[PDB]
Design a protein around this ligand. Structure first.
Ligand SMILES: [Fe+3]
Ligand SMILES: [Fe+3]
Ligand SMILES: [Mg+2]
Ligand SMILES: [Mg+2]
Lengths: 286, 286
């Protein structure tokens, strides 16, 4: 109390001793992660270029900007895992998971940067896109919001796992949808297949956050969680309708605002709470 | 001065941005780590038990004790990477490597534990072996030595990479030789195969240490490195001849003493220094 009453956060003199397994649910999340390991090199990019050149200039803009956003955010997710989550959490099973997630975030980042390098030959444009945190106004709101939660010294782990479930779950959901939309139009198999791997990986990272949440003894209030989730939805929605609008690739903005609300509902439920928006999923392809 | 003079350790505002790669040498080692990924499940242990049962009782004692030593040490290595190296090193390329070494250490720990669970069914004997740091005097020296370098708030990164290259290079070399000895005797393909994978990985983790060392501007002196490596050789030698004698599996304690000295000379050469012992490699199987 406040931390020593938490099985997840209290001193474990066996934290670096692997066996035996005590938390089987947490352990299996780690085994699932491990069993789905992939490298960036596995993704065949060799047919993507022709599709990319056939695209309209504004689509190539949207897509390059989504890639840059993803690449930048992974780094923020990674910072939090490395500096906080993997430090403060004391159960071995959770540490293995987080250890592996860090590895995977690096492969996610590499993939996004391979996609960028493959499509965009201009090194000035590459640099612009890689430095997206400094160079892209559209990512600011999202990058700032996530970095806040790293630097926040008061906030409990419970509130902070929520925020990063919001990052990997809500902040990514519009862009994931976007690439799945492109699959619907038979465009860029390399991008869209890599997109399947990464969103699966990200959904798993949210599942894990939810599982960590359940094992918390002192959870934040439904009130407080709602506060964070709604806040994250609004930002995502502003990102997708204003800062980098989805019309750029032929999508309905209104329906996207709705889907972001559906994702948040699903995450709220997964966190042991009640829906907030009570809306259906408008996308049969998600 | 203090440490802002070090390319490896000075502020890197781009530390979580993957691209572009600037340290190609360091990055290719990450790619090599990543290309050699494996899981414990991949190793077939089915054919091992009949050989296990054929051994003399003091051969089983020796092996299970080498296994327990390994699972213990991995956790210390792990602690160090998690709490220290991956935190303090600022170049993106190196953080990827360490990020991945952490994941591979957890797989190594699992492997060793699986070996133990497979050969040893007695629950009490399992607990005794997993708790080897508290329960096994033979590993006290090696463990305390390593742990001292995590706690040491004054030693430089330059000294501590040497220390952990000694841990993964010298503290493991005798035990690795043991298992290759069993391979020569045609015993236990599962054990000896998993031993092939792990000694390869640890060679790499040592190679990586050497590469980091080479990139430091303020290296420790040859004298100071000698002192550390020599201290390590004596502890490993005591281990293999006094505390857990390799005699117990039919090896010569005099030739093993020598092999440790040869491993250390090789490490010293790799750190950019001169030999210490000048003895040749007595085992034709390393
Ligand atoms: Fe993620
Ligand atoms: Fe290692
Ligand atoms: Mg444990
Ligand atoms: Mg960088």
């Amino acid at each position: 109390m406040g931390v020593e009453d938490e099985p997840l956060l209290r001193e474990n003199p066996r934290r670096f001793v692997i066996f035996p397994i005590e938390y089987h649910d947490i352990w299996q999340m780690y085994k699932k992660a491990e069993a789905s390991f992939w490298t960036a090199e596995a993704v065949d990019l060799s047919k993507d270029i022709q599709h990319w050149e056939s695209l309209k200039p504004e689509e190539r803009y949207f897509i390059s900007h989504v890639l840059a956003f993803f690449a930048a955010s992974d780094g923020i997710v990674n910072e939090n895992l490395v500096e906080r989550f993997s430090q403060e959490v004391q159960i071995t099973e959770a540490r293995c998971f987080y250890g592996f997630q860090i590895a995977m975030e690096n492969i996610h980042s590499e993939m996004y940067s391979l996609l960028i390098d493959t499509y965009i030959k201009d090194p000035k444009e590459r640099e612009f896109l890689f430095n997206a945190i400094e160079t892209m106004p559209c990512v600011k709101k999202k990058a700032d919001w996530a970095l806040r939660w790293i630097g926040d010294k008061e906030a409990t782990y419970g509130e902070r796992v929520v925020a990063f479930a919001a990052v990997e779950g809500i902040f990514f959901s519009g862009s994931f949808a976007s690439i799945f939309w492109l699959k619907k139009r038979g465009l860029m198999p390399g991008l869209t297949f890599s997109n399947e791997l990464i969103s699966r990986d990200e959904g798993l990272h949210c599942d894990f956050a939810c599982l960590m949440f359940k094992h918390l003894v002192h959870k934040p209030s439904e009130e407080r969680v709602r506060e964070i989730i709604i806040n994250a939805v609004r930002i995502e929605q502003e990102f997708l309708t204003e800062a980098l609008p989805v019309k750029l690739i032929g999508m309905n903005c209104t329906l996207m605002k709705q889907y972001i609300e559906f994702v948040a509902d699903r995450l709220m439920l997964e966190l042991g709470f009640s829906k907030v928006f009570r809306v259906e999923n408008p996308f049969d392809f998600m």
